[PDB]
């Protein structure tokens, strides 16, 4: 039927976000201890790295989202929910997937933070070419501009402070990461349980044959089509797995902020759960990709 | 090429709204135009899902329901009041936009129209 619970509730809906920031802060700060700045400028100065990946999600992924719209003949609400997901920048949770993939972790940031600063300038003007007949009003104001900067900077701080630890005393990296492995696993329990308390109950309605089909094949095409254009275009073979996991993976916590404001919530219904469900299959597709390229070593 | 209604006779009557063309609408609602008055909101239903939002007076009385198989939309009425005599105008919403449910600006397609009368 409906989505009974109301969102933005202090008891549980805030615990999904006020704890996720704590979850992301330490994780990426811990992730920040595997990058050397002295070769970061090498990635930036010669743009052969990000160019294939940045184009792979600002000139290719919107096509994948838009093609699935017209081909599947989805209504102009879900045909726009998956298009907004397509234009979304490189996911802050994608940088995790480069670590397990043995990819070039230094090039992950150069296409995560640099491809999010383009979301400010592309997406507002990337919708006029893709919402010409899917939405009547303008999307200029609906985009959460102040919700990206407070998201990029919250990501940028562990990006730099994560390596700065190697400047004063890295002896205290032992004193930090030895507990980070111990401690951050407690947060994931709080993150996963509370989600099943508030939004997980009404998930059963959200599934739809023409909605799971897009949410299942779109993270997959983003993965594969991001890789072939990466490795085959003369880029390093071992570095290609960094681009592949960045093209397919992209944030969807930014799409939900648009649907809340773009148009009324009774039209949405439990379509609020698509970005939550999209990441589940986005995560699920990768966790099948992790093993396969961990098989090639063995 | 507009939507097609049935029913609406002198008086519990249920009236259908079938789309006259194969079109994909994310939400369909019913509106009512009182004699010599502005059209007022009556009922709403989501299309993919079952979200519904009836108007103030009609909160308990009427009931709007779709069918999975066909594309018709129904509005079952019960306990009709003699102030409900008006001309009901089925409405459909094709393209998404920011507009109030109660407001008529959200709906891109309208209906042929049918008149309901009671005593």
Name all domains of chain B by residue range, CATH numbers in brackets: 4-116 (2.60.40.10)
Contact call for residues A255 and A81 (beta carbons, < 8 A): yes
Backbone phi, psi, residue A185, to 5°:
-75, -20
Best CA proximity match to A116, nearest among A156, A83, A82: A156
Report the candidate in B32, B37, B35 with the shortest Cα–Cα distance to residue B57: B32
**Residue A128 in tokens:** 């006029």
Non-local (6+) Cβ contacts of A241 within 8 A are A98, A101, A102, A103, A227, A293
DSSP SS3 for A250? strand
- Contact between B30 and B75 under an 8 Å Cβ cutoff? The reply is yes
- Cα-flanking dihedrals φ and ψ of residue B45, to 5°? -145, 140
- Taking alpha carbons only, the member of A246, A248, A275, A278 closest to residue A113 is A246
How big is chain B, counted in residues? Answer: 119
Which of B25, B30, B26, B27 shows the shortest CA–CA distance to B5? B30
For residue A239, how far is the Cα from the chain centroid?
Answer: 20
| Tokens 């743009």 found at | A47
Give, in order, the Cα–Cα distances in Å from A232 to each of A117, A216, A220, A245, B119. Answer: 27, 25, 18, 16, 77
User: Is the separation of the CB atoms in A119 and A147 below 8 Å?
Assistant: no
| Structural determination approach | cryo-EM
Measure the CA–CA gap between B27 and B33, rounded to whole angstroms: 20
Q: What span, in angstroms and rounded, lies between the C-alpha atoms of B69 and B113?
A: 24
Phi and psi at residue B63, to the nearest 5°: -150, 130
Please provide the distance, in angstroms rounded to a whole number, between the alpha carbons at the two ends of chain B.
33
Q: Which residues of B touch A135 (CB under 8 A)?
A: 95-97
Cα–Cα distance measured from residue A269 to residue A276, given in angstroms and rounded to the nearest whole number: 14
Residue in the block written with tokens 């400047």: A167
CB contact under 8 A, B96 and A205: no
Q: Which of B25, B24, B8 is nearest to B115 (CA)?
A: B8
Residue B53 contacts A where some CB pair is shorter than 8 Å: yes
B63 bridge partner residues:
B76
Q: How far apart are CA A205 and CA B49, in angstroms?
A: 8
Hey, how many other C-beta atoms are within 10 angstroms of the C-beta on A295?
Answer: 8
B61 — contact with chain A (CB < 8 Å)?
Answer: no
* Cα separation, A223 vs A246, whole angstroms: 8
Cβ neighbours of residue A238 closer than 8 Å, sequence gap 6 or more: A102, A103, A104
Of B25, B53, B94, the CB nearest to A266: B53
Query: Environment class of residue A71 by beta-carbon count within 10 Å: exposed (0-12), middle (13-18) or buried (19+)?
Result: exposed
Choose among A297, A215, A243: nearest CA to A110: A243
What are the counts of helices (DSSP H) followed by strands (DSSP E) for chain B? Answer: 0, 9
Radius of gyration of chain B (CA): 13
CA angle B117, B33, B113 (to 5 degrees): 75
Token pair for residue A17?
């976000």
| CA angle (A143 as vertex; A25, B27 as ends), nearest 5 | 115
Query: Is the minimum CB–CB distance between B99 and chain A shorter than 8 Å?
Result: yes
Positive/negative CA dihedral, A240, A244, A245, A246: positive
Q: Which of B61, B42, B39 is nearest to B53 (CA)?
A: B42
Tokens standing for residue A173: 């990296």
Dig out the tokens for A286 from the structure: 């990768």
The DSSP call for residue A6 is: P
State the best of A73, A76, A208, A273 to mutate against chain B, taking most chain B CBs within 10 Å: A76
Pairing of strands B14-18, B72-76: antiparallel
Spatial separation of the C-alpha atoms in residues B43 and B75, rounded to whole Å: 8
Residue contact B27–A267, C-beta within 8 A: yes
Find residue B14's DSSP bridge partners: B76
CB B97 within 8 A of CB B107: no
- Enumerate the β-bridge partners of residue B76: B14, B63
Assigned token pair, B87? 């001309």
> How far is it, in rounded angstroms, from Cα A64 to Cα A31?
31
Residues of chain B contacting A1 with CB distance shorter than 8 Å? 49-51
Return the CATH class of domain A12-296: mainly alpha
Place of tokens 């509005």: B75
Contacts of B93 in chain A (CB under 8 A): 267
- Phi and psi torsions of B46, nearest 5°: -70, 160
Supply φ then ψ for residue A19, to 5 degrees. Answer: -100, -30
């Amino acid at each position: 039927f409906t989505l009974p619970p109301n969102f933005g509730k202090r008891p549980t809906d805030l615990a999904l976000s006020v704890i996720l920031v704590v979850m992301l802060f330490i994780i990426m700060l811990s992730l920040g201890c595997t990058m050397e700045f002295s070769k970061i400028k090498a990635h930036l100065w010669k743009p052969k790295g990000l160019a294939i990946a940045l184009v792979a999600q600002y000139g290719i992924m919107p096509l994948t989202a838009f093609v699935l719209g017209k081909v599947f003949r989805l209504n102009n609400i879900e045909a726009l929910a998956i298009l907004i997901c397509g234009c979304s920048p490189g996911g802050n949770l994608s940088n995790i997937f480069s670590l397990a993939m043995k990819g070039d972790m230094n090039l992950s940031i150069v296409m995560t933070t640099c491809s999010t600063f383009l979301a400010l300038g592309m997406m507002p003007l990337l919708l006029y070419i893709y919402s010409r007949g899917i939405y009547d009003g303008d999307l200029k104001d609906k985009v959460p501009y102040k919700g990206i900067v407070i998201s990029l900077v919250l990501v940028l701080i562990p990006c730099t402070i994560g390596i700065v630890l190697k400047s004063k005393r890295p002896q205290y990296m032992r004193y930090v990461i030895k507990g980070g492995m111990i401690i951050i696993l407690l947060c994931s329990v709080a993150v996963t349980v509370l989600s099943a308390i508030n939004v997980g109950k009404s998930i059963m309605f959200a599934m739809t044959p023409h909605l799971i089909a897009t949410s299942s094949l779109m993270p997959f095409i983003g993965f594969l089509l991001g890789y072939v254009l990466s490795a085959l275009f003369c880029l390093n073979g071992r570095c290609r797995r960094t681009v592949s996991m960045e093209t397919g993976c992209q944030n969807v916590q930014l799409c939900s902020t648009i649907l809340n404001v773009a148009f009324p919530p009774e039209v949405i219904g439990p379509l609020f759960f698509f970005p939550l469900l999209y990441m589940i299959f986005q995560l699920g597709e990768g966790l099948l990709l992790i093993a396969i390229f961990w098989c090639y070593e063995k | 090429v507009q939507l097609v209604e049935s029913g609406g006779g002198l008086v519990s009557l249920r009236l259908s709204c079938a789309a006259s063309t194969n079109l994909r609408s994310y939400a369909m609602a019913w509106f009512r135009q009182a004699p010599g008055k502005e059209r007022e909101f009556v009922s709403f239903i989501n299309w993919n899902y079952g979200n519904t939002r009836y108007a103030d007076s009609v909160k308990g009385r009427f009931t709007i329901s779709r069918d999975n198989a066909k594309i018709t939309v129904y509005l079952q009425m019960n306990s009709l009041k003699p102030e409900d005599t008006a001309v009901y105008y089925c409405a459909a919403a094709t393209i998404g936009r920011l507009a109030g449910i109660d407001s008529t600006t959200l709906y891109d397609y309208w209906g042929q129209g049918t008149q309901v009368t009671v005593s």
